[PDB]
C-alpha cells in the first residue's frame, strides 16, 4: 500500500490479532481456526494467547491503570489507541516483546469492552492496532519473517521457571 506490499503481512496480522482479542473477550477458546492468516496464524494464535496473557499476568495492574485513562467509548477509541501507540514507540524500541504487549493491552481492554457490550469497537480495534503497526514497521516485521519469527522466538515456554 503506502510503501511496497506490506499488506501481505497485514492480512495475517489483522486476523491473527482479531482472533486473539475475540478469544480473550469471551474468555473461552472458542475462536475458530483462522484460515485467512494461514499456518502462521495458527502458530501465532497459540503464542499470542499464551504470551499475550502472560504480559497481563505480571503487570495487569498497569493495564488497569491505562484502561482507566483510555477514553474508549465512541469511534474515537481507535484514535485513542493510536494516541498511546505513537507514544509507546517514541523511544524507537520495536523489540518483539513490546508488540506482544501492545496486543496484550488492547486485548485486556477488549475484555472489559466485551463486558460493557461494546463489541462493535473490539472488532475494528484489532484492525486499528494492526494497521498502524504494519504501516510504521513494515520493514521490522519482514526482518523477523513476520509472525513466523515471532512464533519461533515466543513459541517456547520459560526455562527458568516463572
Amino acid at each position: 500500500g503506502p510503501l511496497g506490499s506490506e499488506d501481505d503481512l497485514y492480512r495475517q496480522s489483522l486476523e491473527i490479532i482479531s482472533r486473539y482479542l475475540r478469544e480473550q473477550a469471551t474468555g473461552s477458546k472458542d475462536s475458530k481456526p483462522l484460515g485467512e492468516a494461514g499456518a502462521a496464524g495458527r502458530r501465532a494464535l497459540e503464542t499470542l494467547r499464551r504470551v499475550g496473557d502472560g504480559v497481563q499476568r505480571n503487570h495487569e495492574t498497569a493495564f488497569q491503570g491505562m484502561l482507566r485513562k483510555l477514553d474508549i467509548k465512541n469511534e474515537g477509541d481507535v484514535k485513542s489507541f493510536s494516541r498511546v501507540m505513537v507514544h509507546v514507540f517514541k523511544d524507537g524500541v520495536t523489540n518483539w516483546g513490546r508488540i506482544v504487549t501492545l496486543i496484550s493491552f488492547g486485548a485486556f481492554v477488549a475484555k472489559h469492552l466485551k463486558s460493557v457490550n461494546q463489541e462493535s469497537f473490539i472488532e475494528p480495534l484489532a484492525e486499528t492496532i494492526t494497521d498502524v503497526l504494519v504501516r510504521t514497521k513494515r520493514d521490522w516485521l519482514v526482518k523477523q519473517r513476520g509472525w513466523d519469527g515471532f512464533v519461533e522466538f515466543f513459541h517456547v515456554q520459560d526455562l527458568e521457571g516463572g
Binding site: 503487570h59 523511544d91 524500541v93 516483546g97
Partner: peptide
Amino acid sequence: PADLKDECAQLRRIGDKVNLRQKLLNM
C-alpha cells in the same frame, strides 16, 4: 490527556521486560 505519559511509559517498559525475559529464556 498529558498524564498518559506515565501510562504509556509503563506499556513501553512492560514490553521491554517481556523481550528481556524471553531473550534470556532462549539464549
